[PDB]
Every structure is written in structure tokens, then in C-alpha cells.
Design a protein around this ligand. Sequence first.
Ligand SMILES: Cc1cc2nc3c(=O)[nH]c(=O)nc-3n(C[C@H](O)[C@H](O)[C@H](O)COP(=O)(O)OP(=O)(O)OC[C@H]3O[C@@H](n4cnc5c(N)ncnc54)[C@H](O)[C@@H]3O)c2cc1C
Ligand SMILES: Cc1cc2nc3c(=O)[nH]c(=O)nc-3n(C[C@H](O)[C@H](O)[C@H](O)COP(=O)(O)OP(=O)(O)OC[C@H]3O[C@@H](n4cnc5c(N)ncnc54)[C@H](O)[C@@H]3O)c2cc1C
Ligand SMILES: NC(=O)c1ccc[n+]([C@@H]2O[C@H](COP(=O)([O-])OP(=O)(O)OC[C@H]3O[C@@H](n4cnc5c(N)ncnc54)[C@H](O)[C@@H]3O)[C@@H](O)[C@H]2O)c1
Ligand SMILES: NC(=O)c1ccc[n+]([C@@H]2O[C@H](COP(=O)([O-])OP(=O)(O)OC[C@H]3O[C@@H](n4cnc5c(N)ncnc54)[C@H](O)[C@@H]3O)[C@@H](O)[C@H]2O)c1
Lengths: 153, 153
Amino acid sequence: MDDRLFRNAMGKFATGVTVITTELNGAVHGMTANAFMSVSLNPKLVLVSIGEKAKMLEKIQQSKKYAVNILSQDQKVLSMNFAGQLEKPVDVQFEELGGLPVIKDALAQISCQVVNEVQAGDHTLFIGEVTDIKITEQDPLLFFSGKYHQLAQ
Amino acid sequence: MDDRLFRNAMGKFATGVTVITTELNGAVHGMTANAFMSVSLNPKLVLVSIGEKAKMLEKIQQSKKYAVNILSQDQKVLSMNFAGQLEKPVDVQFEELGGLPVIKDALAQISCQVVNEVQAGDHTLFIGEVTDIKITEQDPLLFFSGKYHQLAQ
Ligand SMILES: Cc1cc2nc3c(=O)[nH]c(=O)nc-3n(C[C@H](O)[C@H](O)[C@H](O)COP(=O)(O)OP(=O)(O)OC[C@H]3O[C@@H](n4cnc5c(N)ncnc54)[C@H](O)[C@@H]3O)c2cc1C
Ligand SMILES: Cc1cc2nc3c(=O)[nH]c(=O)nc-3n(C[C@H](O)[C@H](O)[C@H](O)COP(=O)(O)OP(=O)(O)OC[C@H]3O[C@@H](n4cnc5c(N)ncnc54)[C@H](O)[C@@H]3O)c2cc1C
Ligand SMILES: NC(=O)c1ccc[n+]([C@@H]2O[C@H](COP(=O)([O-])OP(=O)(O)OC[C@H]3O[C@@H](n4cnc5c(N)ncnc54)[C@H](O)[C@@H]3O)[C@@H](O)[C@H]2O)c1
Ligand SMILES: NC(=O)c1ccc[n+]([C@@H]2O[C@H](COP(=O)([O-])OP(=O)(O)OC[C@H]3O[C@@H](n4cnc5c(N)ncnc54)[C@H](O)[C@@H]3O)[C@@H](O)[C@H]2O)c1
């Protein structure tokens, strides 16, 4: 059992792709995440998992809020941008939802207030209560086996 | 803000589909789950999220272990089965990995020991340390907007 074997295995679980956003003292910060899930119905809770070394970790710890932007099929470049994979950052179009910066034309936008924070090995889980939601009927960006994919139409 | 709006939103995050399995007195229990994610690299941690009213909850609390079986495209019937959606249960073919019952021909099989248990609203998060992994190169069953889907080929 290598780290590569584990990552390969984990990559067998297909997911959508989100960008996590928050605002700290004026500035908008974003991070590409697929470790996201729906947690609870009553109350409305959601969870995101952030690596210990990630700049986003301290940002969320201070702001105590975050939004989750589910990316559409047309937003592959944004995924790469917020994953630190482009040499030059793109000029991202933000709007607002429940007091959070959200990404324009995202498949879906979900704004949260952090209600719990749980360390789990390498990462921290931020459990958030959902305050606002915006949905569209776009097709999703998918991530599977280390590659970007689309739904069969 | 209705429960339907929240569920619709949450459905906008595409996922693979797993069956969580465990063993209590040699009886094998399974439950369909898509609230699953990779958590930590060092140590190797995974997380699953189980509803407070789910029979699986108490089973895992006792056994202190679970396997995650990621379903292939060919396993839609299994997903429906372990979701309580068929009138008559199907005869499921089990095998073994790390002392856990796993589903034969799954896309991937991941066996875990529970290392933490965190309540989060409606649900409990069982954080699991991975002991054993088996992977194949099959295509995944997908779940998105309340429907089963496939990857574009
Ligand atoms: C598909 C995929 C899924 C991933 N899932 C997760 C996961 O769930 N959990 C996890 O911890 N990591 C995940 N990662 C890795 C993570 O996205 C990167 O490690 C990321 O670079 C870490 O961001 P950071 O907070 O450390 O800050 P940085 O490394 O600085 O942020 C990454 C990039 O975002 C850009 N950026 C930030 N804010 C803005 C803005 N205001 N406008 C324009 N650009 C901006 C920056 O230019 C930078 O290049 C994933 C990566 C991929 C590709
Ligand atoms: C795609 C999708 C994703 C879901 N994700 C989640 C989630 O992540 N978290 C969550 O809590 N719920 C989730 N659910 C709901 C969950 O799958 C159902 O609520 C399930 O019925 C609850 O199982 P239970 O533990 O309460 O026991 P039951 O309701 O009794 O189990 C469901 C079915 O599994 C069958 N079964 C169990 N063991 C065996 C076996 N040994 N051999 C053959 N059949 C067996 C039973 O016949 C039963 O019909 C999801 C449902 C769907 C369709
Ligand atoms: N922290 C995360 O939850 C996470 C998820 C995906 C990618 N990433 C990071 O982004 C970079 C690019 O990703 P890639 O194209 O190599 O995809 P990849 O092939 O490494 O990812 C496939 C799967 O492996 C798992 N994984 C990868 N890194 C992980 C980590 N650090 N902690 C927990 N699970 C992890 C995830 O479940 C992911 O979906 C890599 O450095 C990777 O580590 C991190
Ligand atoms: N507990 C869960 O994480 C979960 C996830 C999916 C489906 N289910 C249950 O299985 C049954 C059939 O599912 P469906 O075909 O109606 O799909 P659906 O349209 O209700 O599911 C779409 C999304 O909504 C979210 N969701 C649904 N029920 C949830 C719950 N009880 N708690 C937290 N998030 C939830 C999930 O993220 C899911 O991916 C429903 O009763 C549903 O509640 C539960």
C-alpha cells in the first residue's frame, strides 16, 4: 500500500468540482475542492475538507464562513485556476450571496456559516450551516481517475 | 427556503455511488451511500456520513469497522437494493477484504477501521482508517440531480 495506490483508489470515487470561497478583510479567497458533501437536512448542514497546509484553512478559521461554488462543464479553467495550476491567475467574475463572494455562472452556489471544525489527520473538516442557495440547470464538471470528465448526454 | 430546494441544490454535486458494508456476528449489512469522501493522506483516512435513523448507524458503532464499495456502471441494481428501493432483496455476491465483507466486481473496495465518530445535525460522520484497497478500471455509476448517470466516453 503506497500513497499512490491510496490516491488512485480515492480517485475511483467520481465527484463534481467546487470552488470554496470566502472573504477576509476586503479580499476574496478561493480554493478548488472536491472533498465536499451534504451532511444534514435538519439543520441544513454541509461539510468541506481542507488540507492543513492550505492558505484557505486559516482564512476560514478567521472569517468563520465560506461559500461552495459547484462548477459547470464550462468552468474547467476556473477549477485549474483555484487549484494553483495556472502560472497567471485569471480575472474571476464574483457576485454575492448571503454575504459571501460567489462565482458567476457556477452550476450552483451555497453560502455557509461555520458551526463546527474537526481535525482529521492531514485535514480539517469545516461543517457549515447553509444560509442561501442558488441553482441553475447546467451540466457539471466531473473529476474521476485524476481527469476532468462530463456526463454522458 | 424549503427542504426540496436544499435537496435539489445538494443534488447538483455529482458523485459516484458506494455501498457501505460491515459485519456483525457474521451477518453482513449494507447501505447505499454517496456521502463519502477522502479525508487524509497521512494517516490514510476516509469518511462516511450516516443518517441518525439508519440501521447501519448502530451496526457500525458496534463493529467499529466498515468497507466502502464503489459501484461500477453495471451495478445500478445493487445501488437500488442497498437503498431499500426493491420489494425483494437481491442475492448479493460478497467476498472479503481486510476482514470486511466487500462486493464482488465493485469498481473499488476500501476496508476501514473507525477511528472517530462525530455527530453533525441529522447524521453521524464515521472517520475511518484504510487498511486494505482493491481497484479495477471499470467505469463508475454516477448520481446527479436525483438520477443515475454515466461518464461521457
Ligand atoms: C479537482 C481537484 C480537487 C481538489 N480538492 C481539494 C480538496 O477538497 N481539499 C483540499 O484541501 N485541496 C483540494 N485540491 C487542491 C487545492 O485546490 C490546491 O492545493 C490549492 O492550490 C490550495 O489553495 P490554497 O488555499 O493553499 O491557496 P493557493 O495555493 O494560493 O490558491 C490556489 C490558487 O487560487 C488562486 N486564487 C485565489 N483567490 C483568487 C481570487 N480572488 N481571484 C483569482 N484567483 C484566485 C490563486 O491565484 C492560486 O493560484 C484539489 C485540487 C484539484 C485539482
Ligand atoms: C444514491 C443514493 C445515495 C444515498 N446516500 C446516503 C448517504 O450517503 N447517507 C445515508 O445515511 N443514506 C444515504 N442514502 C439512503 C440509504 O441508502 C437508505 O436510507 C437505506 O435504505 C438505509 O439503510 P439502513 O441502514 O437504514 O437499513 P435498510 O433500510 O434495511 O437497508 C436498505 C436495504 O439494504 C438491503 N440489504 C442490507 N444488507 C443486505 C445483504 N446482506 N444482502 C442483500 N441485501 C441487503 C436490505 O434488503 C434493504 O432493503 C442514499 C440513497 C441513494 C439512492
Ligand atoms: N485534499 C484533497 O481532498 C484533494 C483532493 C483532490 C486533489 N488534491 C490535490 O490536488 C493536486 C492535483 O490533484 P490530482 O490531479 O493529482 O488528482 P489525484 O489523482 O491525486 O486525485 C484523485 C483523488 O485522490 C484523493 N486525494 C488526492 N490528494 C489528496 C489529499 N492530499 N488528501 C486526501 N485525498 C486526496 C481525492 O479523493 C481525489 O479525488 C494534488 O496535489 C492533490 O493532492 C487534494
Ligand atoms: N443522507 C444522505 O446523505 C442521502 C443522500 C442521498 C439520498 N438520500 C436519501 O435516499 C432517498 C432517495 O434519494 P433521492 O433519489 O431522493 O435523491 P435526492 O434528489 O434526494 O438526492 C440528491 C442529493 O440531495 C442530498 N440529500 C438527499 N437526502 C439527504 C439527507 N437525508 N441528508 C443530507 N443530504 C441529503 C444528497 O447530497 C444527494 O446527493 C431519499 O430519501 C434521500 O433522502 C440520503
